[PDB]
Symmetry: D2
Amino acid sequence: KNMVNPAVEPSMEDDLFAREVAEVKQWWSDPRWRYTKRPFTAEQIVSKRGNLKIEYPSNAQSKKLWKILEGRFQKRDASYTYGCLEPTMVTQMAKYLDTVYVSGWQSSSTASSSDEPGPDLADYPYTTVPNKVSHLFMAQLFHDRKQRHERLSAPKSERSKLQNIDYLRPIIADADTGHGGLTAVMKLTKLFIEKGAAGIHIEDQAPGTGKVLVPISEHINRLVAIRAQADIMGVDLLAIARTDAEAATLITTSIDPRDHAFILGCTNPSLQPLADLMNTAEQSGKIEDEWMAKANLKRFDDAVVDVINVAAKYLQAAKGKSNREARAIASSLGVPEIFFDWDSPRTREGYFRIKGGCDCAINRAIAYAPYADAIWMESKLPDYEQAKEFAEGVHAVYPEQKLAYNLSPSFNWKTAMPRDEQETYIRRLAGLGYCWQFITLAGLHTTALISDRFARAYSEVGMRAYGELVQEPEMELGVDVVKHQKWSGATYVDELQKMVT
Amino acid sequence: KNMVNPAVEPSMEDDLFAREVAEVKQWWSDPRWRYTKRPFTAEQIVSKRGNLKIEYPSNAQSKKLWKILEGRFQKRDASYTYGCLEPTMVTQMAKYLDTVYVSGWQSSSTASSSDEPGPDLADYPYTTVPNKVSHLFMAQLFHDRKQRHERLSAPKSERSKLQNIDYLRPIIADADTGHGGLTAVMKLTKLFIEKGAAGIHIEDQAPGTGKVLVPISEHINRLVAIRAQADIMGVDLLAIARTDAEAATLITTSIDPRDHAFILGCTNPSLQPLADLMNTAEIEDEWMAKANLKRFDDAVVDVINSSSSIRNPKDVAAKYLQAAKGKSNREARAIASSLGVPEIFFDWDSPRTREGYFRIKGGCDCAINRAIAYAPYADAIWMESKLPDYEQAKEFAEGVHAVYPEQKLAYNLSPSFNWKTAMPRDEQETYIRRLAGLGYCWQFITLAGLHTTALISDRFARAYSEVGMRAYGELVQEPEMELGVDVVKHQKWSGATYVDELQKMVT
Amino acid sequence: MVNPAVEPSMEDDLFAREVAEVKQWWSDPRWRYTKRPFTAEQIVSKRGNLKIEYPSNAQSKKLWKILEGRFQKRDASYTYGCLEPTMVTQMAKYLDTVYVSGWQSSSTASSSDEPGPDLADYPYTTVPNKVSHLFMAQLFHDRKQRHERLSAPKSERSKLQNIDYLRPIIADADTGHGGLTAVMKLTKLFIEKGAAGIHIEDQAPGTGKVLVPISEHINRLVAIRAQADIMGVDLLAIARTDAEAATLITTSIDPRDHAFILGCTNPSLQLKRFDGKSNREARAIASSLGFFDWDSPRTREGYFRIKGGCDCAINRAIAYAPYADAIWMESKLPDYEQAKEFAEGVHAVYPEQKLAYNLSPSFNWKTAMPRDEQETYIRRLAGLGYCWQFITLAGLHTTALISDRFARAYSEVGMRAYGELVQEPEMELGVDVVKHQKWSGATYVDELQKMVT
Amino acid sequence: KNMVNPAVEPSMEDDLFAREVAEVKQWWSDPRWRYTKRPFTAEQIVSKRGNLKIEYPSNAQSKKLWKILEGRFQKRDASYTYGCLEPTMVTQMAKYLDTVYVSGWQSSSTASSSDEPGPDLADYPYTTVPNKVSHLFMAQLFHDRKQRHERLSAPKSERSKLQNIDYLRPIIADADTGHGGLTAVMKLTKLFIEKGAAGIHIEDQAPGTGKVLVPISEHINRLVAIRAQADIMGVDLLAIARTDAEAATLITTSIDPRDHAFILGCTNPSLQPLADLMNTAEIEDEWMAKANLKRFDDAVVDVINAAKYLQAAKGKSNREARAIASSLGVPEIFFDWDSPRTREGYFRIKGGCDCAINRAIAYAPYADAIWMESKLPDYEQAKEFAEGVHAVYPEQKLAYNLSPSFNWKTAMPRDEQETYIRRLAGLGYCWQFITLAGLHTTALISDRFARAYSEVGMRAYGELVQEPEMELGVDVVKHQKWSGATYVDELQKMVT
Ligand SMILES: [Mg+2]
Ligand SMILES: [Mg+2]
Ligand SMILES: [Mg+2]
Ligand SMILES: [Mg+2]
């Protein structure tokens, strides 16, 4: 029994736990957390920790990101970036952009852990996006080492002629829906932190599925689970809440009364259930359209008003209320019993119909804000006014809440906006409190564009194409990579080699 | 015990082996192998096989590539491609180029299996390059399914308005020096075949090391291990042999008589070994000068022209050269001695480095001797060059073709070259066709993928940092739309419709 | 250098040839119990222009041939969850199938190396990667042994081992790890890594076990088959139902679940089943002949209350059968008569449906049974039609036993423990691993190198 | 231009450098480094570093390991363990053993990163063994967490009925050769540190290749390359030097003077170079006999036929040793090293005890622990090996591989088996390990149980597995709790 020992002596267990809860409570008092709500205590967090404290460089980048985005919000400016594929691209973005985005969409088509690509359905294995974050972070880390060495090796007077690129640009990545239940969310979060992420975003859709939402309660839990995992690991990982309620058409359950005001119901008492009808149509293929119309689906508020045609007094009192207390309000104002069934128009998967929109999205963001360092509302157009509506809507309740914007390529920016305004779109939005903006898929498109250009030219005229469209433009622009050996770290590793010999 | 069974019943083992050995024999009679030397039997091969025979899509692509390269060589045309970084890129390449190249260099800086990058030393883990091959090949396969579906879902009258891309462009990949001994070479070759490589290339350098060479014997075994493993897995993998002898300055050992003509020696009988001196000094370029290093033949001829007499110096010299061409040092020594040439002082041990490497004077003639040595064990050959010299490229081809006239060649359109300062634009354009006439039937820009991606990224982010969203519309989205880039309607391109018709089929 | 991949003039004829081939395939005996809700034409539409053949298919064919002859004789193949290659080379001598456990994987083989209880929150690359691990090892030791046997003279061969290492593998696909697209991606991985058959549960991912409706778990079972078709393989699909012990269900939308959904019966407040008909059809039946509420006792998550048990599980197994090559119902205890009721309930509609059984280690086999009945338990269940049986966690438990046993003894008496507790018994049993170089393939690779030089 | 900035302002670069180089020199003075030669300067090391400082759990386990082995050696005791395979095993070992070993041999047969198995030639991808380290180490961190939670979730008055296992047992693993050049070594060392390793060992073999040695200078370089990598990430990683000299017959080159005493030469002036011969013919064993190969010092004695020679010639560079003879009036000795070279180019060598000791001594200043690969449980040889290195460096930790292949039932009486580890620990062998123990234990139960289960079914699971597991108090028999079910449902409840 020479090698048997306890792992923490029982005479110190209680006394170390105290010492640690005092450190966590004192950590939680830092202004980093002044907008953050934790429905758990330091005691429950520390009692899940083990005896070996791990420190992550993720944390340092979270902090770096937090400093950046606050000066961004306080000055009503914006950091903006785009969706990076791979280390060559990240080394060039670092010269001009202070954040890095890692897209799940680009990852679905370029970076799945199983190599099986496809559309953006978050059906890649969930190591995918974190593994891409590491791919970039380890390349950032490396080029930092390479450059530092080149600088410090030369005389101070001479360093003015050398490049001084900030490669350590903090990374924000897509956690999708969280890839499962709340045990998966914490595990996913754990990978993002182990792999270098400075912040992640998570969205209120259902996984495995118009878009289908989860109840607000389910998404809050997610946001808490992320925070619960960063606490425990001791890190300042930004968490970002995305709502897909603007164009969502379905919801999994009707159990959260915050969601009631938007759930659509059939107002036709003669109609049987849709699912009953669709199944018991046993003989047929490729009728749902008419059950829909003949059911005259409405929000309950609209259904109440339409019966009335008191209305105004109804809307004022009913705002935010469950279905039961909205019926009750109405019939207390002399309104007949309205027929409102929201089971009947359920899909054959069991899902509920919803009418989303900008109002449903403000509701969800405000619900999510105590648990989210930043928010965004996916939208169908790059319309500045809708953006101001949403932002004033959220800032009515929480005027310090940071916001984030997706400058999407799913938009046709020629037929959506004049050139003079494309130029001003980030600056204006920043004025509303969108301190972080990003183009999800630029990496994909830039790459597809020059590969199409060059492979064509190269096919037609050969090595003329490499000189004219690649190697000579590189020179004139001063792109470091044209001197590829020096860029790859050949001089850095040569000095390592000699230091050892 | 009614779950206990043999594997094959002992009464059928000898028979199954005879059938297989027959199949391998018939297979090796295919014209594919008409230039192929196999220093092993079919029985030896089959004895290494198991009871479950596996079939690889790699094989399909190797067969597809072989037929392509055969057509090019005979017409003296060329297939040319470049080093592909990623699936997005590979989907664009597939439109215009019939092959794909996967680079060790690009992989070292963008694709190590450990995510740790660095200069091209082949010190990434050896899963690195095959994993990139699976990366591209699995995307090629997907985009094939997507497009076959969209096409077949439309009626014949409407299919000509639809893209019809060959996404299955065969992949050629870097295997470096094989990453260790012959067993790793076999293990490496096995990963490549499992992940979809049509062909692989391997260099005559020494791993872990002014390039250092391995002896000809050692590199020939690499090339044989490859073939011995493709045989076994029953596939038709192309094995490309690359020699770095044109620029190399060093070699691991002096044991191969085919390298004895290029190995350098000291001709100064007074000097102490360079290693003994360097150790005792705890210069070096100083010892070298006083060492007066030379290939043995030149050392022998310089003795002939310094030795009155020897009354017939030009006739002794000439005769020695013709007789010693391709001979060991020992055999060369005897011949000169048989000719009345005084004993020559020649020490090739004394200039060894502190690592124990021998010096060597490479260059084109050494590269030629190496390629001729590798040729029967290689489906294609190349010689690394220091600049795009057409003439040296022609001297190298003619040297190989003097002995093996039908030996396919490969050329590296290196971006380590300065193409503005090597060649006018009009001659830039003809270069690949010129090289194709000499039988360089496969050509490739190794790092084009890295540089194209670097260039769009440096100029799009700069603009983006400058004029925001106008940059994206100016530089990216509008040009995509004008050029008709399929990726620009990116949901369709990713297969949004293919997967939708997949889940509707199931529900 | 620009070519089209399939000329337009050959597209239709090639599509035609291929649809005819799939139909001639589906007319094979292997598919005589199998319901496909889609056509060959649809399936080919989802294929590309390069056919890939998989070793998986040979193993699926081997497994079918195995279980057919076992079911026809009311016999049984039985195995256990294998952890790891050393173990699989030892199993291969006495057991003809191999099981790969999600439970064992969650605790020892997750792709992220982060362990935890069996909640299927590991990356879905986890279990198919464990199939490859064992399979790649199987194919090796097969090549090693074939060389040794064929290197020797037939006279001396009977004195050599002759193990079937290619023992067909069955693996846990849990719930599918997502919606149907993920199921097909997951199914695609197993077929590529070498699975002979996979199994999949009617639980809900992310979650008193909670159920999915019958229709959702049929789709899982069709997505699987549809991915095997397309890839051209004969993957065996095992449907598992956790109904005997389930208490919740995600939605009420399916009419086949109505017969078991528990409703409230105190009008005062804000539990019993109603009684194969729907509820609207059930009420209409009762008032064609002369109060029931299930939205109230919903959980805070929106789940419906339900009453499981053999009745609920016979309902579900009969729904899945046309879509499944084998059925099993996970039980709380190893109860013969319960196993007789289940088999009888299913065979009363599908006499021919193969069955599977979990000889659970979650059980207490000393308490629940005597040693004589222990020896016959498998044999008896085989009479019922359970043709494939397995101990999920035997691998985990054997490894933990000998490890605790040996690490302890080795800590007390050094190398005496290694000689006494390991080496000496290894030789008395004639364990091939004791000659470790040879076992590892040292002679195989040696001859490989010698053949190259 | 609102997003561009330099990463370190030029005005702070010189100051930050100076302060970090200050931290390294302070760090290098710790007692931990008192035996350690560093052929490079703090300035050279920090010049390779980046701007972002990274802390590794490896470091903590390095420091735990060192503190364990320091005590073992002063006390002339030993830590022992064996080659662990997988997390189920490591949670069981943790109860009774204080270190964990990760084997290349086991990993080649059970854990390659490509899933392609094979005999120990270190020809798997070099991600293989660091990946196994992580496999085990992430398992240790979880069970540590799970058990801390169980214990803290219980009143103090009740904890003594609960387990208290040290799952954070420091891991030592196999770096083989380094898997190539020195850049490969640093990259491989870099992985081990990122993945959890407390220590690693590396060998003087040539990769890709009787055994073939590298020259002494080359392996020293490997060691320095490990330590430099560790000194960049700022970790106390243990570096173990293994020599394979005692059974080695080949070496790659003769360029290193310290190897000269063991390289065999030809003593026959009548013979042509072996390779010259073998080639013309395309007989070796005949040549090897007729060449009469001896190490230089023996061919010199035979010529004399002396004591003053062997006294002066020890560890000298042949060109020196030859002149040593020339000074003592000794005729021209005919020795040729290059003749007996193999067809691959390798030199012949005669290893054995005196070679391993010579190499061990040359490695020690770069090695936190030394060991000589042994094929045989000979106590007397362990003594001679130890006493030799201890003549020069008496405080060198040593390590020892306990043979799994040898027949222990006959090698030694039972009682001497019981004492073997203790007897070696008295020589300085403070860390000891059976490499393949994990493989054999798994192979023993699997054969044993699979047969019984094929024969008597479920009876065999109760009789040979479930009942003994209960009677022994194996925490795994309650598998749900052991997996950490209670730890995770408490996690979830904390959230919701
Ligand atoms: Mg996404
Ligand atoms: Mg390379
Ligand atoms: Mg499971
Ligand atoms: Mg090893």
